[PDB]
Design an enzyme around this catalytic site. Structure first.
Site, PDB file in Angstrom:
ATOM      1  CG  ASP A 153      -2.113   1.020   0.981  1.00  0.00           C
ATOM      2  OD1 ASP A 153      -2.463   1.273  -0.192  1.00  0.00           O
ATOM      3  OD2 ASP A 153      -2.649   1.549   1.981  1.00  0.00           O
ATOM      4  CE  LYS A 155      -3.010   4.642   0.441  1.00  0.00           C
ATOM      5  NZ  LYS A 155      -4.495   4.575   0.201  1.00  0.00           N
ATOM      6  CG  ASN A 158      -0.651   4.618   3.591  1.00  0.00           C
ATOM      7  OD1 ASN A 158      -1.626   5.310   3.896  1.00  0.00           O
ATOM      8  ND2 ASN A 158      -0.768   3.397   3.071  1.00  0.00           N
ATOM      9  CG  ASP A 171      -2.966   1.648   6.538  1.00  0.00           C
ATOM     10  OD1 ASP A 171      -3.098   0.423   6.730  1.00  0.00           O
ATOM     11  OD2 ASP A 171      -3.916   2.394   6.203  1.00  0.00           O
ATOM     12  CB  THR A 188      -4.048   2.866  -3.397  1.00  0.00           C
ATOM     13  OG1 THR A 188      -4.074   2.762  -1.966  1.00  0.00           O
ATOM     14  CG2 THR A 188      -4.764   4.134  -3.818  1.00  0.00           C
TER      15      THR A 188
HETATM   16  C1  LIG Z   1      -3.160  11.565   9.649  1.00  0.00           C
HETATM   17  C2  LIG Z   1      -3.347  10.314   8.417  1.00  0.00           C
HETATM   18  C3  LIG Z   1      -2.176   9.652   7.868  1.00  0.00           C
HETATM   19  C4  LIG Z   1      -2.410   8.629   6.867  1.00  0.00           C
HETATM   20  C5  LIG Z   1      -3.782   8.336   6.484  1.00  0.00           C
HETATM   21  C6  LIG Z   1      -4.026   7.224   5.456  1.00  0.00           C
HETATM   22  C7  LIG Z   1      -3.929   5.839   6.136  1.00  0.00           C
HETATM   23  N1  LIG Z   1      -4.044   4.760   5.125  1.00  0.00           N
HETATM   24  C8  LIG Z   1      -5.031   5.615   7.195  1.00  0.00           C
HETATM   25  N2  LIG Z   1      -4.570   4.645   8.175  1.00  0.00           N
HETATM   26  C9  LIG Z   1      -3.522   4.951   9.151  1.00  0.00           C
HETATM   27  N3  LIG Z   1      -2.891   4.075   9.966  1.00  0.00           N
HETATM   28  N4  LIG Z   1      -1.928   4.482  10.832  1.00  0.00           N
HETATM   29  C10 LIG Z   1      -1.749   5.842  10.716  1.00  0.00           C
HETATM   30  C11 LIG Z   1      -0.761   6.657  11.509  1.00  0.00           C
HETATM   31  C12 LIG Z   1       0.199   6.057  12.468  1.00  0.00           C
HETATM   32  C13 LIG Z   1       1.176   6.879  13.230  1.00  0.00           C
HETATM   33  C14 LIG Z   1       1.184   8.320  13.016  1.00  0.00           C
HETATM   34  N5  LIG Z   1       1.857   9.402  13.461  1.00  0.00           N
HETATM   35  N6  LIG Z   1       1.514  10.609  12.968  1.00  0.00           N
HETATM   36  C15 LIG Z   1       0.497  10.368  12.082  1.00  0.00           C
HETATM   37  C16 LIG Z   1       0.230   8.963  12.057  1.00  0.00           C
HETATM   38  C17 LIG Z   1      -0.710   8.125  11.335  1.00  0.00           C
HETATM   39  S1  LIG Z   1      -2.828   6.475   9.509  1.00  0.00           S
HETATM   40  C18 LIG Z   1      -4.936   9.019   7.044  1.00  0.00           C
HETATM   41  C19 LIG Z   1      -4.711  10.031   8.033  1.00  0.00           C
END
Ligand SMILES: Cc1ccc(C[C@H](N)CNc2nnc(-c3ccc4[nH]ncc4c3)s2)cc1
Lengths: 334, 19
Positions: A153, A155, A158, A171, A188
């Site tokens: 995934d 992109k 992420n 993710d 995606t």
């Molecule tokens: C803000 C955001 C970032 C990515 C997305 C797309 C993504 N596929 C959605 N799933 C996600 N899983 N873990 C995520 C994650 C983990 C640690 C982190 N530290 N700081 C930010 C942050 C984000 S996000 C959506 C919103």
């Protein structure tokens, strides 16, 4: 040696995979400060620890929704993978817990924001800027692949940017442990390899194709294959015809032609020499791989704590915890 | 321009994984 490095990486991974910690914290220890992202996947919030004052990114998943969307396996697997892997460009899970209604994964916060927003805001990244990020992904995939893990995934959405300007991959809901082929249709649209789209059994080489898509987008400002909707995007992808912006260097185009190669017997990262064909490619001639891993390269771009200036705004919604436990057995191992 | 075509495609915002 790098080979020797990977050696220990595997042992530590196998070791941590057996042992996964549960409920290392509770919701009352965190003060919500801002929703950083929300959508079908759920939502991530910036939280502040009430005792230490440190900040974290908390991902909240509604148990009933996960079941409904049939993502039980994926949800348990991301947690499991997250706590088992360890690399400088992979975000870390620091706490996890659950209550009657939700599941919570408290991870490292990346102050710099989403690479996606910076890319759209700035327009496109210069080749050196694109190369700096690309180098990090190459090392991360080298690492993941050595553990037989396919990310699936890749992109800009992420890839988070930390305080030093380096990347934190997020993710892992689609990542899978696989030695040879796998068959799930996932990922995606714009970033799907042809073989995935063609419903064939594919391998880790789809991540390398994705890398090509990523580098192209970073450098051009838009993906190599686009259309109004997925179906049309797939048509262009399988046709494999790519055109490069005139500002693309000869070396960058050569690299991309070898990454965005439909023929799996010719795609870089999938040949006899592995990731070395990529690392030794002309476009990466000036790249100091050891220095990147060691984080000794001054980032080309670097976007107090708890600051969320780098993230977009979303309406703040409640964190409802039901009176009755919901889906207890489905998430017993969480 | 290619960039113009991209915009016209309308998929310029954050993209979801397929389900
Ligand atoms: C803000 C955001 C970032 C990515 C997305 C797309 C993504 N596929 C959605 N799933 C996600 N899983 N873990 C995520 C994650 C983990 C640690 C982190 N530290 N700081 C930010 C942050 C984000 S996000 C959506 C919103």
């Amino acid at each position: 040696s790098v080979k020797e490095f990977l050696a220990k990486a595997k042992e530590d991974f196998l070791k941590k995979w057996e042992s996964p910690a549960q409920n290392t914290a509770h919701l009352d220890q965190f003060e919500r400060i801002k929703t950083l992202g929300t959508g079908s996947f759920g939502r991530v919030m910036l939280v502040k620890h009430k005792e230490t004052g440190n900040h974290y990114a908390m991902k909240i998943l509604d148990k009933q929704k996960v079941v409904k969307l049939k993502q039980i396996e994926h949800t348990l697997n991301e947690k499991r993978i997250l706590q088992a892997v360890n690399f400088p460009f992979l975000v870390k899970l620091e706490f996890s817990f659950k209550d009657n209604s939700n599941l919570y994964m408290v991870m490292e916060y990346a102050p710099g924001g989403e690479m996606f927003s910076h890319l759209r805001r700035i327009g496109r990244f210069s080749e050196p800027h694109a190369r700096f990020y690309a180098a990090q992904i190459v090392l991360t995939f080298e690492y993941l692949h050595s553990l037989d893990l396919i990310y699936r995934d890749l992109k800009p959405e992420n890839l988070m940017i930390d305080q030093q300007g380096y990347i934190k991959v997020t993710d892992f809901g689609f990542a899978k442990r696989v030695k040879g082929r796998t068959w799930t249709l996932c990922g995606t649209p714009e970033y799907l390899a042809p073989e995935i789209i063609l419903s064939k059994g594919y391998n880790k080489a789809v991540d390398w194709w994705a890398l090509g898509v990523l580098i192209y987008e970073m450098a051009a400002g838009y993906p190599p294959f686009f259309a109004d909707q997925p179906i049309q995007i797939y048509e262009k992808i399988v046709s494999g015809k790519v055109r490069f912006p005139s500002h693309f260097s000869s070396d960058l185009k050569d690299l991309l032609r070898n990454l965005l190669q439909v023929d799996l017997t010719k795609r870089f990262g999938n040949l006899k020499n592995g990731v070395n064909d990529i690392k030794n490619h002309k476009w990466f001639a000036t790249t100091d791989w050891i220095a990147i891993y060691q984080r000794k390269v001054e980032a080309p771009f670097i976007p107090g704590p708890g600051d969320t200036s780098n993230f977009d705004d979303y309406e703040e919604e409640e964190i409802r915890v039901s009176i009755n436990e919901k889906c207890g057995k489905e998430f017993s191992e969480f | 321009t290619t960039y113009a075509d991209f915009i016209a495609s309308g998929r310029t915002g954050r993209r979801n994984a397929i389900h």
